[PDB]
Amino acid sequence: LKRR
Amino acid sequence: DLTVEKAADVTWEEEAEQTGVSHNLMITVDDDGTMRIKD
Amino acid sequence: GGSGVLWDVPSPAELEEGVYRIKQQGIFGKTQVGVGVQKEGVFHTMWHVTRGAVLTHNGKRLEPNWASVKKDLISYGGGWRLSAQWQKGEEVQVIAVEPGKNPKNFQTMPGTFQTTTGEIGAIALDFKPGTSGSPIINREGKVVGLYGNGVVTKNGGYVSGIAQTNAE
Predict the structure, then answer these.
(1) Closest Cα partner for C16 from B16, B33, B37, B6?
(2) Cis status, amide bond into C123, omega within 30 of 0
(3) Which of B5, B9, B10, B30 is the best substitution to test chain C (most C C-beta atoms within 10 A)?
(4) Disulfide-capable partner of C86 in B32, C25, C144, C146 (CB 3.0 to 4.6 Å)?
């Protein structure tokens, strides 16, 4: 999703 | 508890693999840091 | 969600400049949760990687001095010291430090994210969990931002902003  | 271990130096390598895509998108960032694509 | 900003005061914990794996204890052992950059005595990473938790080297404590949730950035040992700004149309490298992998530079020409404020570079590269905080550098070898806070496209693609503030 939006974050690593 | 969190630990830290050295990995590499901050150096530009000359014959680096090129990759990726250039998107042009409209987004909002809300206060909690969440990015959302304008719909 | 909640937001917060912290801005602080330097301590009376020495690290060589460079890129670091941020690891967390077991049992089972240590696991990479992210990446950070040490520059000029200050350790720079992304807020969501540590959430302000104490870092440890050797040794003794390293404690947060500045953080911003909206920016998704945090600095340990002093205020932010990475002052370089990405220019529209210049190519960058990501020094990607993935869990269990050798570091590797990846060159890319970022696109742009348009906000009401202004413009942020957009990096359409997809690294494994644990690699947030990897630095994005310019031709001069200077960090223009950190990787790991972004969006998913309508085609399922992952696209990180260049997370940067303005130093000092």
Answers:
(1) B6
(2) no
(3) B10
(4) C144
Phi first, then psi, for residue C41 (nearest 5°) are 80, -5
Q: Please indicate whether the domains covering C1-82 and C83-164 agree at the CATH topology level.
A: yes
Residue ranges per structural domain of chain C: 1-82, 83-164
Interface of C with B in 27-66 (CB under 8 A): 30, 33, 35-37, 39, 43, 47-48, 50, 53-57, 62
Give the class (CATH, top level) of C1-82: mainly beta
Peptide bond into C27 cis (omega under 30): yes
In three-state secondary structure terms, C47 is helix
Tokens at A2, concatenated? 């939006």
Give every CB contact of residue B23 below 8 A, 6+ residues apart in sequence: C111, C122, C124, C153, C157, C159
Which approach determined this entry? X-ray
* Cβ <8 Å between C131 and A2: no
Tokens 């269990």 belong to C100
Residue C76's DSSP bridge partners are: C43, C64
Distance in Å, alpha carbon of B39 to nearest chain C alpha carbon: 10
Alpha-carbon torsion angle C19, C21, C22, C23, nearest 10: -160
Residue of chain C minimizing CA distance to B7: C20
Architecture of domain C83-164: Beta Barrel (2.40)
Judge whether B14 is closer than 8 Å to chain C, CB to CB: no
Q: What is the resolution of this structure in A?
A: 2.3
